[PDB]
Design a protein around this motif. Structure first.
Motif, PDB file in Angstrom:
ATOM      1  N   UNK E  31     -89.766   7.128  78.477  1.00  0.00           N
ATOM      2  CA  UNK E  31     -89.666   6.270  77.299  1.00  0.00           C
ATOM      3  C   UNK E  31     -89.242   7.076  76.075  1.00  0.00           C
ATOM      4  N   UNK E  32     -89.763   8.294  75.968  1.00  0.00           N
ATOM      5  CA  UNK E  32     -89.445   9.182  74.853  1.00  0.00           C
ATOM      6  C   UNK E  32     -87.953   9.413  74.752  1.00  0.00           C
ATOM      7  N   UNK E  33     -87.347   9.710  75.895  1.00  0.00           N
ATOM      8  CA  UNK E  33     -85.911   9.904  75.988  1.00  0.00           C
ATOM      9  C   UNK E  33     -85.140   8.683  75.501  1.00  0.00           C
ATOM     10  N   UNK E  34     -85.575   7.495  75.918  1.00  0.00           N
ATOM     11  CA  UNK E  34     -84.950   6.253  75.475  1.00  0.00           C
ATOM     12  C   UNK E  34     -85.104   6.072  73.972  1.00  0.00           C
ATOM     13  N   UNK E  35     -86.320   6.269  73.479  1.00  0.00           N
ATOM     14  CA  UNK E  35     -86.602   6.125  72.054  1.00  0.00           C
ATOM     15  C   UNK E  35     -85.732   7.026  71.178  1.00  0.00           C
ATOM     16  N   UNK E  36     -85.686   8.309  71.499  1.00  0.00           N
ATOM     17  CA  UNK E  36     -84.940   9.253  70.687  1.00  0.00           C
ATOM     18  C   UNK E  36     -83.452   8.925  70.659  1.00  0.00           C
ATOM     19  N   UNK E  37     -82.934   8.443  71.780  1.00  0.00           N
ATOM     20  CA  UNK E  37     -81.510   8.194  71.899  1.00  0.00           C
ATOM     21  C   UNK E  37     -81.019   7.162  70.886  1.00  0.00           C
ATOM     22  N   UNK E  38     -81.872   6.218  70.521  1.00  0.00           N
ATOM     23  CA  UNK E  38     -81.442   5.154  69.629  1.00  0.00           C
ATOM     24  C   UNK E  38     -82.221   5.150  68.324  1.00  0.00           C
ATOM     25  N   UNK E  39     -82.877   6.269  68.032  1.00  0.00           N
ATOM     26  CA  UNK E  39     -83.555   6.450  66.757  1.00  0.00           C
ATOM     27  C   UNK E  39     -82.570   6.942  65.710  1.00  0.00           C
ATOM     28  N   UNK E  40     -82.314   6.115  64.704  1.00  0.00           N
ATOM     29  CA  UNK E  40     -81.287   6.405  63.714  1.00  0.00           C
ATOM     30  C   UNK E  40     -81.782   7.366  62.654  1.00  0.00           C
ATOM     31  N   UNK E  41     -82.119   8.573  63.085  1.00  0.00           N
ATOM     32  CA  UNK E  41     -82.596   9.600  62.179  1.00  0.00           C
ATOM     33  C   UNK E  41     -82.082  10.946  62.648  1.00  0.00           C
ATOM     34  N   UNK E  42     -81.701  11.799  61.709  1.00  0.00           N
ATOM     35  CA  UNK E  42     -81.239  13.140  62.038  1.00  0.00           C
ATOM     36  C   UNK E  42     -82.243  13.918  62.875  1.00  0.00           C
ATOM     37  N   UNK E  43     -83.527  13.713  62.620  1.00  0.00           N
ATOM     38  CA  UNK E  43     -84.551  14.435  63.348  1.00  0.00           C
ATOM     39  C   UNK E  43     -84.477  14.228  64.845  1.00  0.00           C
ATOM     40  N   UNK E  44     -84.059  13.029  65.248  1.00  0.00           N
ATOM     41  CA  UNK E  44     -84.040  12.636  66.654  1.00  0.00           C
ATOM     42  C   UNK E  44     -83.219  13.603  67.501  1.00  0.00           C
ATOM     43  N   UNK E  45     -82.165  14.158  66.917  1.00  0.00           N
ATOM     44  CA  UNK E  45     -81.390  15.154  67.625  1.00  0.00           C
ATOM     45  C   UNK E  45     -82.245  16.353  67.979  1.00  0.00           C
ATOM     46  N   UNK E  46     -83.000  16.864  67.010  1.00  0.00           N
ATOM     47  CA  UNK E  46     -83.784  18.078  67.236  1.00  0.00           C
ATOM     48  C   UNK E  46     -84.951  17.845  68.193  1.00  0.00           C
ATOM     49  N   UNK E  47     -85.676  16.755  67.974  1.00  0.00           N
ATOM     50  CA  UNK E  47     -86.866  16.455  68.756  1.00  0.00           C
ATOM     51  C   UNK E  47     -86.488  16.235  70.211  1.00  0.00           C
ATOM     52  N   UNK E  48     -85.281  15.718  70.417  1.00  0.00           N
ATOM     53  CA  UNK E  48     -84.765  15.516  71.763  1.00  0.00           C
ATOM     54  C   UNK E  48     -84.663  16.841  72.496  1.00  0.00           C
ATOM     55  N   UNK E  49     -84.116  17.864  71.829  1.00  0.00           N
ATOM     56  CA  UNK E  49     -83.962  19.186  72.434  1.00  0.00           C
ATOM     57  C   UNK E  49     -85.286  19.784  72.916  1.00  0.00           C
ATOM     58  N   UNK E  50     -86.285  19.741  72.042  1.00  0.00           N
ATOM     59  CA  UNK E  50     -87.604  20.255  72.368  1.00  0.00           C
ATOM     60  C   UNK E  50     -88.189  19.479  73.529  1.00  0.00           C
ATOM     61  N   UNK E  51     -88.083  18.159  73.462  1.00  0.00           N
ATOM     62  CA  UNK E  51     -88.534  17.313  74.557  1.00  0.00           C
ATOM     63  C   UNK E  51     -87.973  17.810  75.882  1.00  0.00           C
ATOM     64  N   UNK E  52     -86.653  17.948  75.950  1.00  0.00           N
ATOM     65  CA  UNK E  52     -86.002  18.319  77.198  1.00  0.00           C
ATOM     66  C   UNK E  52     -86.421  19.705  77.650  1.00  0.00           C
ATOM     67  N   UNK E  53     -86.500  20.653  76.724  1.00  0.00           N
ATOM     68  CA  UNK E  53     -86.844  22.013  77.112  1.00  0.00           C
ATOM     69  C   UNK E  53     -88.222  22.070  77.750  1.00  0.00           C
ATOM     70  N   UNK E  54     -89.152  21.279  77.236  1.00  0.00           N
ATOM     71  CA  UNK E  54     -90.502  21.287  77.775  1.00  0.00           C
ATOM     72  C   UNK E  54     -90.502  20.730  79.193  1.00  0.00           C
ATOM     73  N   UNK E  55     -89.821  19.604  79.374  1.00  0.00           N
ATOM     74  CA  UNK E  55     -89.654  19.019  80.698  1.00  0.00           C
ATOM     75  C   UNK E  55     -89.033  20.029  81.658  1.00  0.00           C
ATOM     76  N   UNK E  56     -88.021  20.737  81.180  1.00  0.00           N
ATOM     77  CA  UNK E  56     -87.399  21.798  81.943  1.00  0.00           C
ATOM     78  C   UNK E  56     -88.440  22.830  82.324  1.00  0.00           C
ATOM     79  N   UNK E  57     -89.179  23.306  81.336  1.00  0.00           N
ATOM     80  CA  UNK E  57     -90.245  24.254  81.593  1.00  0.00           C
ATOM     81  C   UNK E  57     -91.241  23.695  82.601  1.00  0.00           C
ATOM     82  N   UNK E  58     -91.561  22.414  82.465  1.00  0.00           N
ATOM     83  CA  UNK E  58     -92.520  21.782  83.347  1.00  0.00           C
ATOM     84  C   UNK E  58     -92.083  21.874  84.800  1.00  0.00           C
ATOM     85  N   UNK E  59     -90.842  21.480  85.050  1.00  0.00           N
ATOM     86  CA  UNK E  59     -90.307  21.365  86.394  1.00  0.00           C
ATOM     87  C   UNK E  59     -90.015  22.742  86.967  1.00  0.00           C
ATOM     88  N   UNK E  60     -89.298  23.535  86.178  1.00  0.00           N
ATOM     89  CA  UNK E  60     -88.748  24.821  86.586  1.00  0.00           C
ATOM     90  C   UNK E  60     -89.748  25.970  86.620  1.00  0.00           C
TER      91      UNK E  60
END
Ligand SMILES: [Mg+2]
Ligand SMILES: [Mg+2]
Ligand SMILES: [Mg+2]
Ligand SMILES: [Mg+2]
Ligand SMILES: [Mg+2]
Ligand SMILES: [Mg+2]
Ligand SMILES: [Mg+2]
Ligand SMILES: [Mg+2]
Ligand SMILES: [Mg+2]
Ligand SMILES: [Mg+2]
Ligand SMILES: [Mg+2]
Ligand SMILES: [Mg+2]
Ligand SMILES: [Mg+2]
Ligand SMILES: [Mg+2]
Ligand SMILES: [Mg+2]
Ligand SMILES: [Mg+2]
Ligand SMILES: [Mg+2]
Ligand SMILES: [Mg+2]
Ligand SMILES: [Mg+2]
Ligand SMILES: [Mg+2]
Ligand SMILES: [Mg+2]
Ligand SMILES: [Mg+2]
Ligand SMILES: [Mg+2]
Ligand SMILES: [Mg+2]
Ligand SMILES: [Mg+2]
Ligand SMILES: [Mg+2]
Ligand SMILES: [Mg+2]
Ligand SMILES: [Mg+2]
Ligand SMILES: [Mg+2]
Ligand SMILES: [Mg+2]
Ligand SMILES: [Mg+2]
Ligand SMILES: [Mg+2]
Ligand SMILES: [Mg+2]
Ligand SMILES: [Mg+2]
Ligand SMILES: [Mg+2]
Ligand SMILES: [Mg+2]
Ligand SMILES: [Mg+2]
Ligand SMILES: [Mg+2]
Ligand SMILES: [Mg+2]
Ligand SMILES: [Mg+2]
Ligand SMILES: [Mg+2]
Ligand SMILES: [Mg+2]
Ligand SMILES: [Mg+2]
Ligand SMILES: [Mg+2]
Ligand SMILES: [Mg+2]
Ligand SMILES: [Mg+2]
Ligand SMILES: [Mg+2]
Ligand SMILES: [Mg+2]
Ligand SMILES: [Mg+2]
Ligand SMILES: [Mg+2]
Ligand SMILES: [Mg+2]
Ligand SMILES: [Mg+2]
Ligand SMILES: [Mg+2]
Ligand SMILES: [Mg+2]
Ligand SMILES: [Mg+2]
Ligand SMILES: [Mg+2]
Ligand SMILES: [Mg+2]
Ligand SMILES: [Mg+2]
Ligand SMILES: [Mg+2]
Ligand SMILES: [Mg+2]
Ligand SMILES: [Mg+2]
Ligand SMILES: [Mg+2]
Ligand SMILES: [Mg+2]
Ligand SMILES: [Mg+2]
Ligand SMILES: [Mg+2]
Ligand SMILES: [Mg+2]
Ligand SMILES: [Mg+2]
Ligand SMILES: [Mg+2]
Ligand SMILES: [Mg+2]
Ligand SMILES: [Mg+2]
Ligand SMILES: [Mg+2]
Ligand SMILES: [Mg+2]
Ligand SMILES: [Mg+2]
Ligand SMILES: [Mg+2]
Ligand SMILES: [Mg+2]
Ligand SMILES: [Mg+2]
Ligand SMILES: [Mg+2]
Ligand SMILES: [Mg+2]
Ligand SMILES: [Mg+2]
Ligand SMILES: [Mg+2]
Ligand SMILES: [Mg+2]
Ligand SMILES: [Mg+2]
Ligand SMILES: [Mg+2]
Ligand SMILES: [Mg+2]
Ligand SMILES: [Mg+2]
Ligand SMILES: [Mg+2]
Ligand SMILES: [Mg+2]
Ligand SMILES: [Mg+2]
Ligand SMILES: [Mg+2]
Ligand SMILES: [Mg+2]
Ligand SMILES: [Mg+2]
Ligand SMILES: [Mg+2]
Ligand SMILES: [Mg+2]
Ligand SMILES: [Mg+2]
Ligand SMILES: [Mg+2]
Ligand SMILES: [Mg+2]
Ligand SMILES: [Mg+2]
Ligand SMILES: [Mg+2]
Ligand SMILES: [Mg+2]
Ligand SMILES: [Mg+2]
Ligand SMILES: [Mg+2]
Ligand SMILES: [Mg+2]
Ligand SMILES: [Mg+2]
Ligand SMILES: [Mg+2]
Ligand SMILES: [Mg+2]
Ligand SMILES: [Mg+2]
Ligand SMILES: [Mg+2]
Ligand SMILES: [Mg+2]
Ligand SMILES: [Mg+2]
Ligand SMILES: [Mg+2]
Ligand SMILES: [Mg+2]
Ligand SMILES: [Mg+2]
Ligand SMILES: [Mg+2]
Ligand SMILES: [Mg+2]
Ligand SMILES: [Mg+2]
Ligand SMILES: [Mg+2]
Ligand SMILES: [Mg+2]
Ligand SMILES: [Mg+2]
Ligand SMILES: [Mg+2]
Ligand SMILES: [Mg+2]
Ligand SMILES: [Mg+2]
Ligand SMILES: [Mg+2]
Ligand SMILES: [Mg+2]
Ligand SMILES: [Mg+2]
Ligand SMILES: [Mg+2]
Ligand SMILES: [Mg+2]
Ligand SMILES: [Mg+2]
Ligand SMILES: [Zn+2]
Lengths: 101, 59, 52, 19, 112, 140, 116
Positions: E31-60
């Motif tokens: 849901x987070x991924x969906x939310x950030x994608x259509x959040x009309x705020x500059x921050x959404x770009x940055x928060x998306x990156x951190x989100x993904x990196x953590x998931x990456x860390x989680x899996x990898x």
RNA sequence: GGAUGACCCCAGGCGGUAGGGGAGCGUUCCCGAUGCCGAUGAAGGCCGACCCGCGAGGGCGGCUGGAGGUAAGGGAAGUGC
RNA sequence: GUGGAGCCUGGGAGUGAGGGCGCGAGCGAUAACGUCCGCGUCCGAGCGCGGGAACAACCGAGACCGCCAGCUAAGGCCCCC
RNA sequence: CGUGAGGGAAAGGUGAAAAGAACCCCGGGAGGGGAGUGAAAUAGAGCCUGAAACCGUGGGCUUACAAGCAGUCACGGCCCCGAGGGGUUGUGGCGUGCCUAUUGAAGCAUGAGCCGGCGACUCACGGUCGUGGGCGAGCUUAAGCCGUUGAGGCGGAGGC
């Protein structure tokens, strides 16, 4: 059976079994003291005038202590008057053994 | 005009209380009937390029 | 404050600046300024009575 | 209504040179 | 098990980013991924990156299933401020704070 | 020994007939009841007073020329928004408010005092709705 | 030798700030506001210790008073009789008796009615 | 009272600005110190509902810290916001 | 009349804008929260406490600390109280 | 900074040793997560310790019929620790910030946004009292000389 006793300038309702804190008495720990009786009640009700002649309450003195420190401070505005005092009121801890008539 | 100014610093409490309306509202999203992706309603799906059944634009 | 290295210039006017009044920055009230009743070289010797 | 005309207490404010 | 990612010294102002981080806290990774994608705020770009990196860390790194991930914790901290001069009228020089953020996202597994 | 503070009490409901009684001197007794200062376990910081039901508030009595002269007053917040209402009119128009207003001003001010005023149930006419709690007829 | 402030002032300030835990706003966070608040606090506590002894006495009386009117006399009358009888049971215990031992209290009333 | 400042007993005083006087606490540095504490953890920091002290303060315990610290008794000041 | 009485010789001061009230006058208008003296008083320094709705100086009264004990002062005892 | 004379700052510390993190993972990078070094890595270079104002995340208690210098006294509820205590605060009582200046300030009179650090009765010489000592019709040396290298003597000119 309960008794209203006077000690340390105050008055307390006491009964056998009661642990009680009162103003410091001059009795060695372990000794027993006889408190005056203003009133008895329960089965018999007898009313002192002011204290009842025969009655007494035997209490064992568990020992003496110092109440948790109370901070007494005085402040006076626009006059640079400040005083700080620490106070620990001493006490005697009693075990109410029995009520005598 | 005589240059109004705040009379007292706003407390931590009072400014944060101002901001009790500042919560963003999450984007309103629906699934795309074709490719099942989440997207805002009444837009053309930017995942597959479909809207109202037909293909409308290259994705 | 007179032995310190700064000039004697008045840093900003006496009045109408909106700021506290000051003289030179060598004032002991300033960080970096002179010190007030600090030590100077001193002779701690005295003459204890020879009989003593 | 006051009869004895009462004089200004303050001057008209004038600007200062700004440090 | 938790996985974590941190973006430091991101040149965005904490108040502005936090607004976005608030949207995904406690949400599924999905849901987070969906939310950030259509959040009309500059921050959404940055928060998306951190989100993904953590998931990456989680899996990898920490043996967590991408499907079970959710945003257990997320918070924005203030980093150092770039103090800048803003010239104003009548000779006055103001100071602007290019504020900076430390974005942290922490992921967990929804055992349910 | 610490002083007795009572665990939650069951409040007592009470019915009073206001007919004929002097406004202020009934008002006084009702207040006392509400604060519960008639019970030996009275505690100042809880509501353990009685519930007081009053009937025939319209038939409350008043000495002197106060019917024509006692003026109740309301300020509205707007310019010239001071309403002056005479006793006669209030009785004629909102009679149960007469005794209520008297009783209210003898209750304490603040959160508890306000909560106690709600334990006053005042009615014009000889009847009241609270058969459910079966109030004790009090002679005061 | 020079004796810069070093460790002293922080330690003093901490004392005050600790003594100010629970206070609203800067009153618990700012040394200066903490100080000011505490000044007041001390005086109130002192004052209220004095006035506590009054607060409880008034309470006792109100409770004694109510328990008397259940027997057809009032506080002032009850106390006079109690005095004429020579009974010295204080108000702290009168009020206790009024609640926990009504028979004992009832005895006391009778003696006081008689003593007048 | 005892024999001298040991402690006990009794009696009385004890609002306080300017101000006088007294007794202390803490800070930096010296003698004590070619010593003593210290990696089995110095100084400093964060806690404490504990102990001592009228108080300023002092201990002690847990945590941090990682290389200094410094007694009884004295001495000297850049000594307390 | 043994009192934080007094007198003597010394060291350290602060103070040298007072203010209200009662009484006695002057000035003023048998005005002023007016002004200037005299006697006293309280605030000043008792903006600590009770009363006077609230309120430095009116009434009560001189707060060493503690008490969930008792008696009073002025003032009060219908409800707020 | 100033035309110039001239004014004139801020800014030190990884660790014993760079052993300064190969390689892998997300990322455009920055940054992070694993791995690895190390006694220690919230010693990771934006590096010793790492206080406070200030900002944030989680948690306990609490709050939308209530009147305020924010506390204090009592009681109750809930939470935590082990006839006890800590946290919180619902109701009740009481309650006019601090400093300065003043006859008098909560005062609608002064100063202070908040925190940390710097910041104000000292020294020389002479005087005058008190005081701890030495000597006492007497007391005492100054410059200097000798000695020491944290050793102390001599010196009587002169002073009271
Ligand atoms: Mg006791
Ligand atoms: Mg005692
Ligand atoms: Mg003040
Ligand atoms: Mg005040
Ligand atoms: Mg004053
Ligand atoms: Mg204009
Ligand atoms: Mg806050
Ligand atoms: Mg907040
Ligand atoms: Mg606001
Ligand atoms: Mg110069
Ligand atoms: Mg110079
Ligand atoms: Mg120079
Ligand atoms: Mg010049
Ligand atoms: Mg000026
Ligand atoms: Mg200004
Ligand atoms: Mg310098
Ligand atoms: Mg100087
Ligand atoms: Mg100087
Ligand atoms: Mg000098
Ligand atoms: Mg020196
Ligand atoms: Mg000097
Ligand atoms: Mg000297
Ligand atoms: Mg949006
Ligand atoms: Mg992935
Ligand atoms: Mg512009
Ligand atoms: Mg511009
Ligand atoms: Mg320009
Ligand atoms: Mg700014
Ligand atoms: Mg800003
Ligand atoms: Mg910033
Ligand atoms: Mg009646
Ligand atoms: Mg009130
Ligand atoms: Mg200093
Ligand atoms: Mg605090
Ligand atoms: Mg505050
Ligand atoms: Mg105080
Ligand atoms: Mg106090
Ligand atoms: Mg009393
Ligand atoms: Mg009596
Ligand atoms: Mg009596
Ligand atoms: Mg019971
Ligand atoms: Mg004595
Ligand atoms: Mg004494
Ligand atoms: Mg006295
Ligand atoms: Mg004194
Ligand atoms: Mg030290
Ligand atoms: Mg040595
Ligand atoms: Mg040494
Ligand atoms: Mg050594
Ligand atoms: Mg050793
Ligand atoms: Mg080791
Ligand atoms: Mg250790
Ligand atoms: Mg040191
Ligand atoms: Mg300590
Ligand atoms: Mg330590
Ligand atoms: Mg070494
Ligand atoms: Mg020593
Ligand atoms: Mg020595
Ligand atoms: Mg100095
Ligand atoms: Mg400071
Ligand atoms: Mg005297
Ligand atoms: Mg005298
Ligand atoms: Mg002197
Ligand atoms: Mg003069
Ligand atoms: Mg005069
Ligand atoms: Mg004069
Ligand atoms: Mg006058
Ligand atoms: Mg008269
Ligand atoms: Mg006159
Ligand atoms: Mg006349
Ligand atoms: Mg006249
Ligand atoms: Mg006059
Ligand atoms: Mg006078
Ligand atoms: Mg003065
Ligand atoms: Mg006086
Ligand atoms: Mg006053
Ligand atoms: Mg006042
Ligand atoms: Mg006081
Ligand atoms: Mg008053
Ligand atoms: Mg007054
Ligand atoms: Mg007045
Ligand atoms: Mg007064
Ligand atoms: Mg009496
Ligand atoms: Mg009387
Ligand atoms: Mg009255
Ligand atoms: Mg009453
Ligand atoms: Mg140039
Ligand atoms: Mg190094
Ligand atoms: Mg090195
Ligand atoms: Mg890495
Ligand atoms: Mg990297
Ligand atoms: Mg290793
Ligand atoms: Mg290793
Ligand atoms: Mg080791
Ligand atoms: Mg790391
Ligand atoms: Mg650490
Ligand atoms: Mg380290
Ligand atoms: Mg840093
Ligand atoms: Mg080191
Ligand atoms: Mg660090
Ligand atoms: Mg840091
Ligand atoms: Mg929170
Ligand atoms: Mg309402
Ligand atoms: Mg409510
Ligand atoms: Mg409220
Ligand atoms: Mg208030
Ligand atoms: Mg109570
Ligand atoms: Mg409680
Ligand atoms: Mg309250
Ligand atoms: Mg202050
Ligand atoms: Mg002034
Ligand atoms: Mg105010
Ligand atoms: Mg103010
Ligand atoms: Mg104001
Ligand atoms: Mg002004
Ligand atoms: Mg002001
Ligand atoms: Mg001025
Ligand atoms: Mg000022
Ligand atoms: Mg200002
Ligand atoms: Mg400013
Ligand atoms: Mg602040
Ligand atoms: Mg001097
Ligand atoms: Mg001298
Ligand atoms: Mg001498
Ligand atoms: Mg000699
Ligand atoms: Mg000689
Ligand atoms: Mg030589
Ligand atoms: Zn699609």
């Amino acid at each position: 059976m309960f008794a209203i006793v006077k000690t340390g300038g105050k008055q307390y309702r006491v009964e056998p079994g009661l642990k009680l804190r009162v103003e410091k008495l001059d009795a060695e720990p372990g000794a027993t003291v006889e408190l005056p009786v203003l009133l008895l009640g329960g089965e018999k009700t007898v009313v002192g005038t002011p204290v009842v002649e025969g009655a007494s309450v035997v209490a064992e003195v568990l020992g003496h202590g110092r109440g948790k420190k109370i901070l007494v401070s005085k402040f006076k505005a626009k006059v640079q008057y400040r005083r700080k005092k620490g106070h620990r009121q001493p006490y005697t801890e009693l075990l109410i053994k029995e009520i005598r008539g | 005009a005589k240059h109004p100014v705040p009379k007292k610093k706003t407390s931590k409490a009072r400014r944060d209380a101002r901001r009790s309306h500042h919560a963003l509202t999450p984007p309103t999203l629906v699934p795309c009937p074709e490719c099942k992706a989440m997207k805002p309603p009444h837009t053309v799906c930017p995942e597959c390029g479909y809207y109202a059944g037909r293909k409308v634009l290259e994705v | 404050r007179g032995e310190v290295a700064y000039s004697g210039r008045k840093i900003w006017p006496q009045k109408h600046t909106g700021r506290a009044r000051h003289g030179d920055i060598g004032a002991p009230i300033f960080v970096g300024g002179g010190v007030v009743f600090g030590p100077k070289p001193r002779d701690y010797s005295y003459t204890l009575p020879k009989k003593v | 209504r006051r009869i004895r005309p009462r004089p200004p207490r303050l001057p008209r404010p004038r600007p200062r040179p700004l440090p | 098990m938790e996985a974590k990612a941190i973006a430091r010294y991101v040149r965005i102002s904490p108040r502005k980013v936090r607004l976005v981080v608030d949207l995904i806290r406690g949400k599924s990774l999905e849901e987070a991924r969906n939310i950030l994608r259509y959040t009309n705020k500059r921050g959404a770009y940055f928060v998306a990156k951190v989100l993904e990196s953590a998931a990456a860390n989680a899996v990898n790194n920490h043996d967590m299933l991408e499907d079970r991930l959710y945003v257990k914790a997320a918070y924005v901290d203030e980093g150092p401020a770039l103090k800048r001069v803003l010239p104003r009228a009548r000779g006055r020089a103001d100071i602007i704070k290019k504020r900076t953020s430390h974005i942290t996202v922490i992921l967990g597994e929804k055992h349910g | 020994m610490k002083t007795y503070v009572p665990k939650q009490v069951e409040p007592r409901w009470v019915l009073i007939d206001a007919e004929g009684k002097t406004l202020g001197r009934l008002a006084t007794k009702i207040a006392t009841l509400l604060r519960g200062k008639h019970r030996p376990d009275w505690t100042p910081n809880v509501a353990m007073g009685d519930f007081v039901v009053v009937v025939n508030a319209d038939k409350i009595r008043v000495t002197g020329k106060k019917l024509e002269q006692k003026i109740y007053t309301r300020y509205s917040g707007y310019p010239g928004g001071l309403k002056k209402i005479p006793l006669e009119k209030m009785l004629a128009t909102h009679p149960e408010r007469v005794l209520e207003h008297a009783v209210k001003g003898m209750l304490p001010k603040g959160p508890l005092g306000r909560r106690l005023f709600k334990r006053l149930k005042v009615y014009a006419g000889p009847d009241h709705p609270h058969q459910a709690q079966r109030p004790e007829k009090l002679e005061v | 030798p020079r004796a810069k402030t070093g460790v002293v002032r922080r330690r003093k300030h901490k004392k005050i700030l600790k003594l100010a835990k629970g206070y609203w706003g800067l009153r618990s966070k700012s040394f200066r506001k903490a100080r000011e608040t505490l000044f007041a606090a001390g005086n109130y506590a002192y004052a209220h210790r004095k006035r506590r002894k009054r607060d409880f006495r008034r309470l006792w009386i109100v409770r004694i008073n109510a328990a008397c009117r259940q027997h057809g006399l009032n506080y002032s009358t009850f106390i006079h009789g109690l005095k004429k009888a020579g009974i010295e049971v204080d108000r702290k215990n009168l009020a206790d008796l009024a609640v926990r031992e009504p028979q004992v209290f009832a005895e006391l009333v009778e003696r006081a009615k008689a003593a007048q």
